[PDB]
Structures are given as C-alpha cells and as structure tokens.
C-alpha cells in the first residue's frame, strides 16, 4: 500500500542522496559521515558515543572519522581539566569553514532534487514527515 | 531552509527505520540488507551487480548476503546452460515465504510510524516525494 511505499521511497531517496553527497563532498575531502560529524559539532562539542548513536554507525567508524578530521585540522579532542578521560570532540575555526562549504553543497543539492516541488508543496511535506520521524525515533530507541 | 530540512529529515527517518527494521527482521534471521536482496529477487532473478548498485552497498556485502541467504535455503545461484559464468540469484519457495513474513513486518512498522497521518496526508506526501526520488536518481547516476 501507500504507507509502505512512503517509507520505501524514503529509503531510495536516502541511498541516492548518500551516493551523490559522498561524490560532491569528496571535493571537500570529506565523506558523508565526516560531514555529519562536522555538522554535529558545529553547534557545540559532542561525545563520540553520541555521534555513533545519533548517526547509526559503529564506534570504530566514528573513531576513524574523528581521527581523519583531527589530522585535517577540522576538530580537536578536548579533555576535562580534572579528568582527562572525559573527551569531547570540538570543531575548529577551519572545521567551521569547511562545514559551511559542506552545508552550501548540501543546500544546492537539496534545491535541485526538490525542484519539481513549489515552496508550498515543500512545506506540506516537511510538517508531515516530521511526524513520521518523531514516531520512529520513539519506537526505535 | 525547508528544502534542506526535508532531505535531512528523510535521512534521520531512514537511519531510525534501518535500526528498527534490523531489530524486527532479526527475528526472521535477516538483516535489513538480506531482506532487500529477497525483496529484489521476489519478482524475478537478479544479477549480483544489480543488487550492489541498486541498494548502494559493496560487492562484498552482496556476496556475504547472498552466501548467507543461500545457506538459509532462501535463494539459489542459477547459471546459464551454455555459459555457467552468467549468474542470476533466484528466490526459492522458502525464500518467498520468508520474504512475505518480512514484508508484513515492514507493513506493520510503516503503519505505526505514519500513524499520525491520515490516508489523504499519506497520499499527498507519496506523490510529492516520488518526484524527489526521480530527480536524485537522475542526478546521482
């Protein structure tokens, strides 16, 4: 039926978007996951545990992504002054500049793919799928 | 803006759905990818190349999934009578029975997550996001 097709179409869109984002972000030396880590840290320091859970990837994938961003000078591992075992991944000035270039790439792509939809149609879809997200996140965890 | 948020929300929905589907399909001894391979072969034999490309996974991931489904007796590798190198992955009677149980699991989950949406609202969203899929697939490949 339709409810099933909505979710199946959402999956197909994600797969295609993921492929194209990896391609376009590659020019910024980033993978789609690397970009997500930057996006996550852009508004405040994040724990590696949060990153893995939020973006549904292994802890090893996060370690690899953070290690990479760290070598690229885009993020830094900050430790508690009293307990250095407490680690937070913080974005750098350069990381924010790269993140912004990435968000613009994402923005350009989003406008292209939703091109057949008017502003109103975009709004109608957004408010509704936001309800779907609320429910699946309640169910999944 | 909104166009960006539509795509970002689509990604979050996919991640949450993927996590829950792996959990619920696990009871059928399948991973989400295993299920996709069964879904793909349910309407006709498929090449391993098609499977990897269609569901954006590595050829190694497909080989592993097919090998697993093969040992579970859900699919079989069929070869051309004249050139055995030409391989097609074909679903079995048991594979179809398991696929149907999987599709019902998917159907039940889809109804839950879209529960806040009326039938009409579901329809409005479907026709519109189908346009987004058409465009990104044209762009991505």
Which among A3, A14, A137 has the least Cβ separation from residue B110? A3
Contacts of A10 in chain B (CB under 8 A): 10, 13-14, 17, 129
Helical spans, DSSP H, in A55-92: 59-71
Which residues make beta-bridge pairs with B79?
Answer: B87
Residue B62 φ then ψ, to 5°: -70, -40
Quick check: helix, strand or coil at residue A119? helix
Q: Domain of A12: which CATH number?
A: 1.10.10.10
Q: What is the resolution of this structure in A?
A: 1.8
Pairing of strands B75-79, A87-91: unpaired
Give residue numbers after which chain A breaks (C–N above 2.5 Å): none
Which structural domain, as residue segments, surrounds residue B95?
A: 1-141
Judge whether B5 is annotated as a binding position: no
Beta carbons within 8 Å of B84's beta carbon, 6+ residues apart: none
User: What is the C-alpha to C-alpha distance for residues B31 and B36, in angstroms, rounded to an integer?
Assistant: 9
Please return the burial class of B81, using the count of CB atoms within 10 Å of its CB with bins 0-12, 13-18 and 19+: exposed
By the 8 A CB rule, do A136 and B19 touch?
no
**Residue B58 in tokens:** 């590595």
Judge whether B1 is annotated as a binding position: no
Let me know: does A32 contact A61? Beta carbons within 8 Å: no
Cross-strand partners of A76: A90
Domain count, chain A: 1
A123 vs chain B: nearest CA distance in angstroms?
7
> Is B141 a known ligand-binding residue?
yes
Closest CA to B29 of B89, B92, B99, B88: B99
Count of A-B CB contacts under 8 Å: 174
């Amino acid at each position: 039926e339709n409810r099933i097709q909505i979710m199946s179409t959402i999956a197909k869109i994600y797969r295609a978007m993921s492929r194209e984002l990896n391609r376009r972000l590659g020019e910024l030396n980033l993978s789609y996951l690397d970009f997500l880590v930057l996006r996550a840290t852009s508004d405040g320091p994040k724990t590696m545990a949060y990153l893995a859970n939020r973006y549904f990837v292994t802890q090893s994938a996060i370690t690899a992504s953070v290690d990479k961003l760290e070598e690229m000078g885009l993020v830094v591992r900050v430790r508690d002054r009293e307990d250095r075992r407490k680690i937070l991944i913080e974005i750098t000035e350069k990381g924010l500049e790269t993140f912004n270039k990435g968000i613009e790439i994402y923005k350009k792509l989003a406008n292209e793919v939703t091109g057949d939809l008017s502003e109103d149609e975009v709004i109608l879809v957004l408010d509704k799928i936001s309800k779907i997200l609320k429910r699946i996140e309640e169910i999944s965890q």
